[PDB]
XYZ file of N, CA, C and O in Angstrom:
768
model
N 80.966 95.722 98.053
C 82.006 96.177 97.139
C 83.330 95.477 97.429
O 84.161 95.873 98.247
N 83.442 94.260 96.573
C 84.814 93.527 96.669
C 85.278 93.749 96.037
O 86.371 93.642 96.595
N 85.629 94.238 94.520
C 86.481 94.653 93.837
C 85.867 95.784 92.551
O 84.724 95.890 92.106
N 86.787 96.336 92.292
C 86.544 97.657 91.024
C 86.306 99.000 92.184
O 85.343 99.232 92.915
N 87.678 99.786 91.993
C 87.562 100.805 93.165
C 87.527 100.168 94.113
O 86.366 99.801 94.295
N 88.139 99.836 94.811
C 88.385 98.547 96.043
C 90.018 99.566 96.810
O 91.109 99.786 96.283
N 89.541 99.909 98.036
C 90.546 100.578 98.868
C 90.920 99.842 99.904
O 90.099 99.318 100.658
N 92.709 99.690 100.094
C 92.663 98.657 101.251
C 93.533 99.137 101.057
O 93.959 99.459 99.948
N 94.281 99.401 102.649
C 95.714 99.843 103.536
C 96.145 99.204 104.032
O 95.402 98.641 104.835
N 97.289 98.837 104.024
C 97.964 97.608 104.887
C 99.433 98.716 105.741
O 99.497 99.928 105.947
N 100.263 97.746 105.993
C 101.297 98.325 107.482
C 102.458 98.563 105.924
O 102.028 98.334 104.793
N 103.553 98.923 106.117
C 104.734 98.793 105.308
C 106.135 98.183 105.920
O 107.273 98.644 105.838
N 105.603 96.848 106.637
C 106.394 96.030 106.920
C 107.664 95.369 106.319
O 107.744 94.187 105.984
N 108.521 96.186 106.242
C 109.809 95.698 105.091
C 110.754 94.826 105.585
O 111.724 95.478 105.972
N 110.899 93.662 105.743
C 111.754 93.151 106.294
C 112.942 93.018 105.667
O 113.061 91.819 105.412
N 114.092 93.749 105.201
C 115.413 93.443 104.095
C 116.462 93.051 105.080
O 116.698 93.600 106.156
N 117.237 91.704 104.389
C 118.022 91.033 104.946
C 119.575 90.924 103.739
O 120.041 89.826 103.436
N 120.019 91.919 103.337
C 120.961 91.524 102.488
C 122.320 91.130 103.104
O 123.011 91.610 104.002
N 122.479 89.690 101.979
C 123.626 89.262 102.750
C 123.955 88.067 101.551
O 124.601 87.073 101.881
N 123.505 88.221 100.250
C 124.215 87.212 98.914
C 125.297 87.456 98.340
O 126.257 88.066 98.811
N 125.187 86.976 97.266
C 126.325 86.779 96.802
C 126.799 88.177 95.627
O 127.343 89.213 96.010
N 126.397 87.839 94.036
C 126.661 89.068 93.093
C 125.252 88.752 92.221
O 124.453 89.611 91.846
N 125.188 87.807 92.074
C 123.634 87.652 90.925
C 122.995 86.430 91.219
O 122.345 86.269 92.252
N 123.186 85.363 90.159
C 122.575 84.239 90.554
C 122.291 83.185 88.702
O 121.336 82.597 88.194
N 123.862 83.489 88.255
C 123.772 83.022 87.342
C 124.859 82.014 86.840
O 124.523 80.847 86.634
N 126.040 82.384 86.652
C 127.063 82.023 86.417
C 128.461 83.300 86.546
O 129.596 83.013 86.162
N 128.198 84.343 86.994
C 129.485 85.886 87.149
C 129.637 86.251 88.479
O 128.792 85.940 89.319
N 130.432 86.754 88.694
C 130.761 87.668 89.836
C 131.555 89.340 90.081
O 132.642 89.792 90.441
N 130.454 89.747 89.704
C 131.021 91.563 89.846
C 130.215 92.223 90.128
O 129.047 91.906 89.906
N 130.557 93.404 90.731
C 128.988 94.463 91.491
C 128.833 94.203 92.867
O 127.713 93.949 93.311
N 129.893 94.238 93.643
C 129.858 94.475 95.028
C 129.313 95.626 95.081
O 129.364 96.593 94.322
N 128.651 95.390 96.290
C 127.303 96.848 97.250
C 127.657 95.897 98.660
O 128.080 94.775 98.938
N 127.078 97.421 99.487
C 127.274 97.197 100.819
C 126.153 98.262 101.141
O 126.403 99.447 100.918
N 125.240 97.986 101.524
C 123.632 98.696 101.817
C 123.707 98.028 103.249
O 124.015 96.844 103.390
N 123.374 98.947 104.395
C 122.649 98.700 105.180
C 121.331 98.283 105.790
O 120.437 99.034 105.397
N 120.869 97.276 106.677
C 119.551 97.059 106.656
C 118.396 97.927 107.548
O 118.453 97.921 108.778
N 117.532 98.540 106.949
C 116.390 98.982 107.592
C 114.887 99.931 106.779
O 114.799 101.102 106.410
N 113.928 98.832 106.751
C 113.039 99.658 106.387
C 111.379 98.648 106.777
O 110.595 98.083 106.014
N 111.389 98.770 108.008
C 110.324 98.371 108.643
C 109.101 98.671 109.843
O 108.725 98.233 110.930
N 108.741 99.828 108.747
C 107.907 101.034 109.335
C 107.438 102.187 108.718
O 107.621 103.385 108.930
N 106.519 101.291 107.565
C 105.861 102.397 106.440
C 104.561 101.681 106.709
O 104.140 101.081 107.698
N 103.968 101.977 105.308
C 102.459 101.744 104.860
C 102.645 101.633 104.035
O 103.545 102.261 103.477
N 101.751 100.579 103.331
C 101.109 99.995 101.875
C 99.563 100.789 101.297
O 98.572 100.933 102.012
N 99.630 101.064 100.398
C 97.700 101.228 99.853
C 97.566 100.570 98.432
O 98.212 100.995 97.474
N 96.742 99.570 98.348
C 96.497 99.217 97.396
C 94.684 99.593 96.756
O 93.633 99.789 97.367
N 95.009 99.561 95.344
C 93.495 100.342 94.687
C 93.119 99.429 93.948
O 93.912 99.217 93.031
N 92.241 98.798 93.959
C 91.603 98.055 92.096
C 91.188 98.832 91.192
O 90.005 99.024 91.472
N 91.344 99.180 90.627
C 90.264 99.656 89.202
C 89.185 99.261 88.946
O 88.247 99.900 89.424
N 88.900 98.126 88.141
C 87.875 97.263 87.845
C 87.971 95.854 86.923
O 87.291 95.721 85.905
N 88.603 95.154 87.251
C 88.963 93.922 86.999
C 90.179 92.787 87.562
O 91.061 92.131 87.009
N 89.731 92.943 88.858
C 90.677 92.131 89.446
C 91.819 92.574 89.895
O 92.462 92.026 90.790
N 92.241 93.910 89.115
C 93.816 94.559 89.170
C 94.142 95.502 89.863
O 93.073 96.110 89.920
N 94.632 95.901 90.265
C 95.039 96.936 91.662
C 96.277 97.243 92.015
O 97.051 96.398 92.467
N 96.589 98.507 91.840
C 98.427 98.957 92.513
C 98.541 99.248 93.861
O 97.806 100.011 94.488
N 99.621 98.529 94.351
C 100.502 98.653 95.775
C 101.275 98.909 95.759
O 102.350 98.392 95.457
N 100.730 100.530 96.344
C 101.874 101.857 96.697
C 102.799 101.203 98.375
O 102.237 100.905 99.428
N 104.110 101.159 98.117
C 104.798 100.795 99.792
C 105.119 102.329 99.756
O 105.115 103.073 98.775
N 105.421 102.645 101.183
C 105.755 103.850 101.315
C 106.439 103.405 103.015
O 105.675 102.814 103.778
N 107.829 103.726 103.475
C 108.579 103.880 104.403
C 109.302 105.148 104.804
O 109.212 106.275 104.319
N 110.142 104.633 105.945
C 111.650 105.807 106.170
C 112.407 106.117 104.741
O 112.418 105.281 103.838
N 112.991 107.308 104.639
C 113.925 107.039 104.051
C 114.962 106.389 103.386
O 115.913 106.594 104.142
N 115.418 105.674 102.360
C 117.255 105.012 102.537
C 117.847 105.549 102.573
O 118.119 106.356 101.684
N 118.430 105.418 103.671
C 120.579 105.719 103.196
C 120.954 104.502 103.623
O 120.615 103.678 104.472
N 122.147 104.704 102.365
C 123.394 104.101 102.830
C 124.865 104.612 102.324
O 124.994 105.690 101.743
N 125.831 103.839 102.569
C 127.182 104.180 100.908
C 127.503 103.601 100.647
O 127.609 102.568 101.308
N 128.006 103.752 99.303
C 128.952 103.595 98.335
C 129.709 102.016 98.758
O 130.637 102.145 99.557
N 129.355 100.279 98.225
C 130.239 99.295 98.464
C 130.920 99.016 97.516
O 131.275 97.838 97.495
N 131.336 99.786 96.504
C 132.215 99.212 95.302
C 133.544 99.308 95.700
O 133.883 100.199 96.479
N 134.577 98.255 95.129
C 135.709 98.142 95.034
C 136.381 99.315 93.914
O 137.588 99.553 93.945
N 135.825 99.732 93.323
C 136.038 101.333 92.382
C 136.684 102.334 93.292
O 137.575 103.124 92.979
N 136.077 102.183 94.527
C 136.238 103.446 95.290
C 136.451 103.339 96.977
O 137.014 104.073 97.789
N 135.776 102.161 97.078
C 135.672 101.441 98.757
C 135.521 102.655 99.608
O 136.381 103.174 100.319
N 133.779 103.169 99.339
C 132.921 103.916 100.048
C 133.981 105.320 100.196
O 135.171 105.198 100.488
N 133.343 106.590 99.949
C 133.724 107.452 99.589
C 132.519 108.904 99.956
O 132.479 109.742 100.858
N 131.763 108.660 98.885
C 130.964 109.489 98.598
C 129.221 108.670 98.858
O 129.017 107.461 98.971
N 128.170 109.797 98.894
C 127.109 109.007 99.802
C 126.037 108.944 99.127
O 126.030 109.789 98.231
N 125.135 108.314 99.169
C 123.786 107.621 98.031
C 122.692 107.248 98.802
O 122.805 106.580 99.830
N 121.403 107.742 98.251
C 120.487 107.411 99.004
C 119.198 107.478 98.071
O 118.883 108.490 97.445
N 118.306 105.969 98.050
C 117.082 105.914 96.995
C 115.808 106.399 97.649
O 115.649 107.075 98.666
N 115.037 105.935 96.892
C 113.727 105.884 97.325
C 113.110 105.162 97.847
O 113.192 104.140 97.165
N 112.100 104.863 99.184
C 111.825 104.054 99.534
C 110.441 103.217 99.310
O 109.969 102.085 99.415
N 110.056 104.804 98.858
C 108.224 104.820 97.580
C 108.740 103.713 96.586
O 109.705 103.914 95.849
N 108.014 102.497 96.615
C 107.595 101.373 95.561
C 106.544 101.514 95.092
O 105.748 102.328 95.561
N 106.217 100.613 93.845
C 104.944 100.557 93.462
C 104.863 98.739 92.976
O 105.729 98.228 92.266
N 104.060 98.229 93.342
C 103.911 96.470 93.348
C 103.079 96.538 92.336
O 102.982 97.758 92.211
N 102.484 96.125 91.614
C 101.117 95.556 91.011
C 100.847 94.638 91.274
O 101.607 93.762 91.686
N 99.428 94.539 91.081
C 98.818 93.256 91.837
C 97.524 92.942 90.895
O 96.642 93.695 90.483
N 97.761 91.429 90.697
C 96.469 90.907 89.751
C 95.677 89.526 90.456
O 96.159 88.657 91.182
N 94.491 89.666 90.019
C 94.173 88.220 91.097
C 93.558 87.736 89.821
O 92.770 88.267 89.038
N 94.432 86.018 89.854
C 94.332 85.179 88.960
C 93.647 83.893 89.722
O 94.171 83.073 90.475
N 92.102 84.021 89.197
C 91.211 83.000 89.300
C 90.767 82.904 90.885
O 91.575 82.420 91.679
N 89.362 83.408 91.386
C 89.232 83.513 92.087
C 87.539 83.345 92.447
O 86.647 83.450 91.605
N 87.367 83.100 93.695
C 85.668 83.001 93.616
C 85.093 82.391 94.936
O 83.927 82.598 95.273
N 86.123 81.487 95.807
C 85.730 80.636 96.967
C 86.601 80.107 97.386
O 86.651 78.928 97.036
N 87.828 80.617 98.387
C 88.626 80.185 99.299
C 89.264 79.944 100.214
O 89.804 81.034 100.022
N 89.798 79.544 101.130
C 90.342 79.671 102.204
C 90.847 80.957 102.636
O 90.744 81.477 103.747
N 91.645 81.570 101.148
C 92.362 82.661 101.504
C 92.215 83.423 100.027
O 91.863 82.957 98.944
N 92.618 84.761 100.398
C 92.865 85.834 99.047
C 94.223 85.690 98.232
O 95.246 86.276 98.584
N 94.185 85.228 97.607
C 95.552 84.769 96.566
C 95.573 85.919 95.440
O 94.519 85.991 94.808
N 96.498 86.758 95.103
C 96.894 87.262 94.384
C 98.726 87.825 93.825
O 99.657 88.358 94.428
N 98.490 87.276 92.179
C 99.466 87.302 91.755
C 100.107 88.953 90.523
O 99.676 89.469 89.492
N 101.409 89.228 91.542
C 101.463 90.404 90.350
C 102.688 90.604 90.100
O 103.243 89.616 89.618
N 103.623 91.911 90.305
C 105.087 92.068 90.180
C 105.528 93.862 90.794
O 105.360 95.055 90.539
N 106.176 92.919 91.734
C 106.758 94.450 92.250
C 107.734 95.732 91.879
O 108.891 95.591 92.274
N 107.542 96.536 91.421
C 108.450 97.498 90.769
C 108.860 98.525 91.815
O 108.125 98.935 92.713
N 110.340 98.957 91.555
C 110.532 99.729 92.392
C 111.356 101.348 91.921
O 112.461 101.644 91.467
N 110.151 102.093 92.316
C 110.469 103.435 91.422
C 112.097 104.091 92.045
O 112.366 104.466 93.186
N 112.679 104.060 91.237
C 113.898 105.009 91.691
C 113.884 106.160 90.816
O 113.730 106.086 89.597
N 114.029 107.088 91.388
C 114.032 108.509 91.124
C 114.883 110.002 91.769
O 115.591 109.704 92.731
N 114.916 111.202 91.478
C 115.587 111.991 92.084
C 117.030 112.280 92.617
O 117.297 111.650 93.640
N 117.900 113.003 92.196
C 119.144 113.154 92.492
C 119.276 112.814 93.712
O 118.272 112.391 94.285
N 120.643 112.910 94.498
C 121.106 112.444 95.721
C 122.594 113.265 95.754
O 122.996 114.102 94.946
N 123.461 112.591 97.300
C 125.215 113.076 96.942
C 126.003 112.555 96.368
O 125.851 111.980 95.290
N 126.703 112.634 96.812
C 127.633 111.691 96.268
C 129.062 113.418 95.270
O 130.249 113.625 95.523
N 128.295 114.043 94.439
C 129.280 115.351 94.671
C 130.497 115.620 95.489
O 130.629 115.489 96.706
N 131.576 116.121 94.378
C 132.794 116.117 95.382
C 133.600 117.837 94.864
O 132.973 118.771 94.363
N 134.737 117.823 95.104
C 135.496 118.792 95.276
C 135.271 119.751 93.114
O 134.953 120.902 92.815
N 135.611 118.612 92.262
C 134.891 118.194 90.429
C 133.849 118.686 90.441
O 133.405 119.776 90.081
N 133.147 117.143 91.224
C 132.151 116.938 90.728
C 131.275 117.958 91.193
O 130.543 118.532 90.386
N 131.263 118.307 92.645
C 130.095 119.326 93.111
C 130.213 120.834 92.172
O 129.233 121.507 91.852
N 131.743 121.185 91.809
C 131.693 122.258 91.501
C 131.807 122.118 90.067
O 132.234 123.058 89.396
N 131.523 121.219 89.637
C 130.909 120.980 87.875
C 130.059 120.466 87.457
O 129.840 120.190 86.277
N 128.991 120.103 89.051
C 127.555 119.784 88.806
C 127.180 118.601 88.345
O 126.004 118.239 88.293
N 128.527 117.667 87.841
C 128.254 116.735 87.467
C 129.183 115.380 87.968
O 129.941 115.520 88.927
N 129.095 114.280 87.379
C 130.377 113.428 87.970
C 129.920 113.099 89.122
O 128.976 113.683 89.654
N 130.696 111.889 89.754
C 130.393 111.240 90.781
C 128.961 110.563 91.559
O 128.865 109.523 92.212
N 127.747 111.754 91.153
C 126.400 110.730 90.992
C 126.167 109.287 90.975
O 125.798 108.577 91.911
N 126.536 108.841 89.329
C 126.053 107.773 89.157
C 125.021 107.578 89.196
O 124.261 107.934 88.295
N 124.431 106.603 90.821
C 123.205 106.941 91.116
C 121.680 107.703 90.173
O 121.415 108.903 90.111
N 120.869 106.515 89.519
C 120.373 107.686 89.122
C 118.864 107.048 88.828
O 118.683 106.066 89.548
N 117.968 107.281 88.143
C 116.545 106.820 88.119
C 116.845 105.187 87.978
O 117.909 104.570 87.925
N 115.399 104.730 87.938
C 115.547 102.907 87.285
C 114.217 102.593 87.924
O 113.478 103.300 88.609
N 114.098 101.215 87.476
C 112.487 100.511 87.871
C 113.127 98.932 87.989
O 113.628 98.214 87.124
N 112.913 98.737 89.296
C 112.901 97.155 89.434
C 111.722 96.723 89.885
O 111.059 96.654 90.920
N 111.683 96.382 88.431
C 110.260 95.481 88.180
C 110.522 93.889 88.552
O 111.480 93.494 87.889
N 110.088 93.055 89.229
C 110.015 91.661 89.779
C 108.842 91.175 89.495
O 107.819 91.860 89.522
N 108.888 89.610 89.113
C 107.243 88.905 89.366
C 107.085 88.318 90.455
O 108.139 87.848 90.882
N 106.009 88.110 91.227
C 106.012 87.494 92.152
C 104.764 87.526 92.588
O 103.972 88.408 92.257
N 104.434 86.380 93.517
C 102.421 86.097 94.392
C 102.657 86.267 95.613
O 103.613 86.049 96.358
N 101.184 86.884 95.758
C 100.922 86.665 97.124
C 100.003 86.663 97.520
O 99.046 87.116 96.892
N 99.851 85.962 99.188
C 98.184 85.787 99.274
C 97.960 86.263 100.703
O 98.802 86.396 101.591
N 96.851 86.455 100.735
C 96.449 87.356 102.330
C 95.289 86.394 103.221
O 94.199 86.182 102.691
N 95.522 85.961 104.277
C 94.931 85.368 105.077
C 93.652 86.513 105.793
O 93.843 87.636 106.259
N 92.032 85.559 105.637
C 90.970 86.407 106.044
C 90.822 85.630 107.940
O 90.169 84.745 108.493
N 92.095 86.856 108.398
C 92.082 86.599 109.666
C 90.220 87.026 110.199
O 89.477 86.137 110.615
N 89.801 88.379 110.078
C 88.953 88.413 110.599
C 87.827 89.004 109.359
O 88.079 88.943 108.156
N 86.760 89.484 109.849
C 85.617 90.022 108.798
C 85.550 91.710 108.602
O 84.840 92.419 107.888
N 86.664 92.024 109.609
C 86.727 94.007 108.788
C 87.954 93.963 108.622
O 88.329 94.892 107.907
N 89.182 92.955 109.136
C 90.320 93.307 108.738
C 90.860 91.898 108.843
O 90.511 91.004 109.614
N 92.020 91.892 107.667
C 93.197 90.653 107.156
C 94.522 90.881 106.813
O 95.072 91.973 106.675
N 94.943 89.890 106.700
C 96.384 89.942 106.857
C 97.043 89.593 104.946
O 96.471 88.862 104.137
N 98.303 90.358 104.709
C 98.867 90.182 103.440
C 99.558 89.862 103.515
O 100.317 90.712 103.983
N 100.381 88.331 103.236
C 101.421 88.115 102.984
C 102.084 87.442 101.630
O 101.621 86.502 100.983
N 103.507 88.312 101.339
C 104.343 88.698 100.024
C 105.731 88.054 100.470
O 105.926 87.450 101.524
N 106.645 88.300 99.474
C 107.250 87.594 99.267
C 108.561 88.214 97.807
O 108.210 88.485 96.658
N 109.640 88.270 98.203
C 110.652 88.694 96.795
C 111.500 87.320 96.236
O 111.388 86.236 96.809
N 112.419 87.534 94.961
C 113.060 86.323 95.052
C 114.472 87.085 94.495
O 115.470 86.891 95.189
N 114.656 88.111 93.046
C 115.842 88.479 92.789
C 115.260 89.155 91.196
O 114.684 88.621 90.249
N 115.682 90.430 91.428
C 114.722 91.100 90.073
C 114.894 92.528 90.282
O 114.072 93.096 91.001
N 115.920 93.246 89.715
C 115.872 94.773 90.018
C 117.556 95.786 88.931
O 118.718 95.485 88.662
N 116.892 96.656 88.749
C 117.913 97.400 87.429
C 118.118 98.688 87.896
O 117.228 99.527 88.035
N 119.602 98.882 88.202
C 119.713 100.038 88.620
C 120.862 101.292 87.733
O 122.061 101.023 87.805
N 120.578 102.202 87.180
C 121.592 102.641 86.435
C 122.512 103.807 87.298
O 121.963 104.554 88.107
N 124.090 103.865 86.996
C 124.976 104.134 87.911
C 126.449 104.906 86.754
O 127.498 104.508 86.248
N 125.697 106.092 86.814
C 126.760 106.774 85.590
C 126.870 108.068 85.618
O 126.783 108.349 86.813
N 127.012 109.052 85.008
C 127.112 110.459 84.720
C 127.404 111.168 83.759
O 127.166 110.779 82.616
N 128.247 112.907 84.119
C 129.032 113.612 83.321
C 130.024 113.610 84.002
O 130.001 114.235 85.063
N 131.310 112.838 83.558
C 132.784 112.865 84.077
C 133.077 113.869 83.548
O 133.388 113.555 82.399
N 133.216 115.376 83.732
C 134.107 116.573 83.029
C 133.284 116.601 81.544
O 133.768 117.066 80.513
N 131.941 116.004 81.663
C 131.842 116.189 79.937
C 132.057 114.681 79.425
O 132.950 114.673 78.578
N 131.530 113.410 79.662
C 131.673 112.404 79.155
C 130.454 111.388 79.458
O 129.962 111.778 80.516
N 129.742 110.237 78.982
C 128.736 110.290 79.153
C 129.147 108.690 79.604
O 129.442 107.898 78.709
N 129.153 108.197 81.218
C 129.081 106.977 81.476
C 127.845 106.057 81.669
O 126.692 106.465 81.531
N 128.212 104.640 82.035
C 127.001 104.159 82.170
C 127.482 102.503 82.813
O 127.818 101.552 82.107
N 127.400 102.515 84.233
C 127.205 100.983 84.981
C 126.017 100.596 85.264
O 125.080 101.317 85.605
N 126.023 99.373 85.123
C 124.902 97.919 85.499
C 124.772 97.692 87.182
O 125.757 97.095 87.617
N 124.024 97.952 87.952
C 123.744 98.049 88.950
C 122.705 97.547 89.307
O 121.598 97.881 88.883
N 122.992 96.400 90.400
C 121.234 95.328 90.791
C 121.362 95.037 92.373
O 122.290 94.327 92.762
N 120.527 95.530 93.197
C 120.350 95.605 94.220
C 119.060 95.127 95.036
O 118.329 95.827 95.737
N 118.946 93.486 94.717
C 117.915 92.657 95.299
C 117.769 91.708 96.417
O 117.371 90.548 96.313
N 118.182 92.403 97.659
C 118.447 91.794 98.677
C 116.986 91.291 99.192
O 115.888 91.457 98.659
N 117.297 90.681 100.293
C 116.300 88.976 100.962
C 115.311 90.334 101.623
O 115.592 90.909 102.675
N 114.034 90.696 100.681
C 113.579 92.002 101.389
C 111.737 91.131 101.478
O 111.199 90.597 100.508
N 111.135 91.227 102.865
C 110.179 90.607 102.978
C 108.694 91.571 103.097
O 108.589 92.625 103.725
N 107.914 91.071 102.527
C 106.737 92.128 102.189
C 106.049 91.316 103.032
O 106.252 90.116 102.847
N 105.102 91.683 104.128
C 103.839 91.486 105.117
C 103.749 91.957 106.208
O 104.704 92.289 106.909
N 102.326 92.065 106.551
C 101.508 93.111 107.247
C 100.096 92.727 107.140
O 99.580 91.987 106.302
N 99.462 93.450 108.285
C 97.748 93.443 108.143
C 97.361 94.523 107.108
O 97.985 95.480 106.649
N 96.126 94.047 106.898
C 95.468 94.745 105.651
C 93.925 95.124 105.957
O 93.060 94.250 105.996
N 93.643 96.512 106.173
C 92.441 96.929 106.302
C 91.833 98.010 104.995
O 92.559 98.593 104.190
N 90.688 98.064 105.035
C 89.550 98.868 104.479
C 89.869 100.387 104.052
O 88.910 101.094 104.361
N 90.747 101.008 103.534
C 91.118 102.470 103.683
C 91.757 103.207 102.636
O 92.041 104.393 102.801
């Protein structure tokens, strides 16, 4: 049983290194200041039945705060560290190694702080912070170190949507927020 219902667990080796610039186009706005750490979860990935299969990451917690020039850290924010990758294997049959190509999404969900003296006691305001999916494309391929267990290695490049708004007193905002720092996916990958 190599693929269709196909169970395999890997480590949740996160290596994030943020330290760019604002995007990667031609602008500059949307300073963040995130701290680095999330290297010490688990991965599970599933096939269905055709090649295709989701990779659940699962780590610590995030925190961090608030790097905007709006406010220059204030109030406190913290996501999710539950991702979900997809994974497709394009053309396959006899190789050195397991090559597969898909796109990593990253579920954001669930309130947080950030509430203040207003905002806490009007339930609303100051949030921001709030659901989104950074969805990315990207490959990767896993080396068949041994014959019950192998190794996965991934890879990010810049790909993620974050929405950052509220109820000001009763008003309905809405900021552009992208938070795709140098974050490295690999680990061994076993049977589970």
């Amino acid at each position: 049983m190599h693929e269709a219902g196909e169970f395999f667990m890997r480590a949740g080796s996160a290596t994030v290194r943020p330290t760019e610039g604002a995007g990667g186009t031609l602008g500059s706005l949307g300073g963040f200041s995130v701290t680095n750490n999330t290297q010490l979860g688990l991965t599970f990935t599933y096939m269905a039945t055709d090649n295709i299969g989701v990779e659940l990451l699962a780590a610590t917690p995030f925190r961090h705060k608030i790097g905007t020039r709006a406010t220059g850290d204030i109030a406190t924010v913290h996501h999710l560290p539950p991702t979900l990758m997809a994974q497709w294997y394009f053309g396959d049959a006899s190789s050195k190694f397991r090559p597969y190509v898909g796109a990593g999404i990253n579920y954001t969900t669930f309130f947080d702080n950030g509430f203040n003296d207003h905002g806490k006691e009007a339930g609303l305001s100051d949030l921001s912070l709030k659901d989104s999916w950074g969805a990315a494309g990207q490959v990767g391929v896993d080396y068949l170190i041994n014959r019950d267990w192998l190794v996965n290695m991934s890879v990010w490049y810049m790909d993620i949507d974050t929405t950052a708004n509220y109820k000001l007193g009763g008003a309905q905002q809405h900021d552009s927020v992208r938070l795709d720092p140098w974050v490295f996916m690999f680990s061994a990958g076993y049977r589970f």
